[PDB]
Amino acid sequence: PGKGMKIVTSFYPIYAMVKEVSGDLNDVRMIQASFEPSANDIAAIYDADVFVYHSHTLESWAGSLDPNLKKSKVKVLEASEGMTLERVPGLEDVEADEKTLYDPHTWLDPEKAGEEAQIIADKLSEVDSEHKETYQKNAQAFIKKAQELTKKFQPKFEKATQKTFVTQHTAFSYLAKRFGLNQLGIAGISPEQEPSPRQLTEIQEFVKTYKVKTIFTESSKVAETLVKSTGVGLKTLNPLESDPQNDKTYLENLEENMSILAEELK
Ligand SMILES: [Cl-]
Ligand SMILES: [Cl-]
Ligand code: NA
Ligand SMILES: [Zn+2]
Ligand SMILES: [Zn+2]
Ligand SMILES: [Zn+2]
Ligand SMILES: [Zn+2]
Ligand SMILES: [Zn+2]
Ligand SMILES: [Zn+2]
Ligand SMILES: [Zn+2]
Ligand SMILES: [Zn+2]
Ligand SMILES: [Zn+2]
Ligand SMILES: [Zn+2]
Ligand SMILES: [Zn+2]
Numbered sequence: 630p631g632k633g634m635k636i637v638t639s640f641y642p643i644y645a646m647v648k649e650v651s652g653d654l655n656d657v658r659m660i661q662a663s664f665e666p667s668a669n670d671i672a673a674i675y676d677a678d679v680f681v682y683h684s685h686t687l688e689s690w691a692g693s694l695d696p697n698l699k700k701s702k703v704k705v706l707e708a709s710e711g712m713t714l715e716r717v718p719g720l721e722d723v724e725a726d727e728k729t730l731y732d733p734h735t736w737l738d739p740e741k742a743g744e745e746a747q748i749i750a751d752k753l754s755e756v757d758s759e760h761k762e763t764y765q766k767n768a769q770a771f772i773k774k775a776q777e778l779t780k781k782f783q784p785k786f787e788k789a790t791q792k793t794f795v796t797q798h799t800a801f802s803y804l805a806k807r808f809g810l811n812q813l814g815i816a817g818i819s820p821e822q823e824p825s826p827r828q829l830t831e832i833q834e835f836v837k838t839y840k841v842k843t844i845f846t847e848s849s850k851v852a853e854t855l856v857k858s859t860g861v862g863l864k865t866l867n868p869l870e871s872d873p874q875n876d877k878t879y880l881e882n883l884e885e886n887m888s889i890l891a892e893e894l895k
Contacts, residue, residue, distance in 0.1 A: 739880065
């Protein structure tokens with residue numbers, strides 16, 4: 630190993646949490662909603678030492694990887710293995726295609742983000758046991774700063790008179806459950822899931838019922854159709870599914886969106 634292990638990550642939260650757990654160690658990079666990585670990414674995955682993805686409920690293509698058939702030494706790691714996933718909003722009481730029932734957007738909960746960084750540190754310690762104390766020490770520093778981020782915004786959401794907000798797609802369910810908030814997504818779990826006409830009417834009644842004055846968009850066009858039907862304002866709220874391309878850490882990018890949400894709910 631020149632720079633250490635060659636680690637490849639699925640998307641931005643996994644790339645950020647692996648990079649901060651590894652720290653100075655290894656060579657961490659990220660492959661280039663729709664998902665389906667290119668032909669070169671899968672080739673780069675089989676040429677790497679470690680590949681880390683979030684969950685089978687998100688990167689469904691990760692389950693088709695067969696390192697034994699391709700004669701590859703890549704060790705695929707599911708960063709959220711063992712974490713308890715909540716039901717998809719609107720499907721809580723469904724008894725059971727089944728992958729559509731569980732919500733994967735846990736990285737937006739500061740507590741569950743630290744839980745995923747610990748699993749990454751544990752799984753990296755099972756592959757690279759010599760540096761196990763560096764992975765755990767970097768993870769505990771990430772968990773500590775995440776738990777302090779939760780303690781900081783917990784009183785900020787308790788005093789909020791408005792605890793209901795609407796976002797571009799159903800991605801902030803874990804964040805709302807962390808601070809006792811209520812949320813509704815225009816689109817479903819995936820941004821491609823366009824609302825049906827009957828569902829759009831429910832979003833209209835939902836905004837009117839709980840006096841929602843703001844729809845949080847992403848940096849879609851169905852959201853621009855309801856700004857006339859509801860008269861709400863538009864503010865940005867990044868679910869951190871794409872790289873913000875800045876010089877902030879993951880928890881700093883997460884805190885920024887939390888501060889945008891907390892100032893609006895007051
Ligand atoms: Cl329920
Ligand atoms: Cl998604
Ligand atoms: Na509900
Ligand atoms: Zn799994
Ligand atoms: Zn539960
Ligand atoms: Zn229920
Ligand atoms: Zn039954
Ligand atoms: Zn090492
Ligand atoms: Zn070393
Ligand atoms: Zn601190
Ligand atoms: Zn999403
Ligand atoms: Zn900084
Ligand atoms: Zn801070
Ligand atoms: Zn401010």
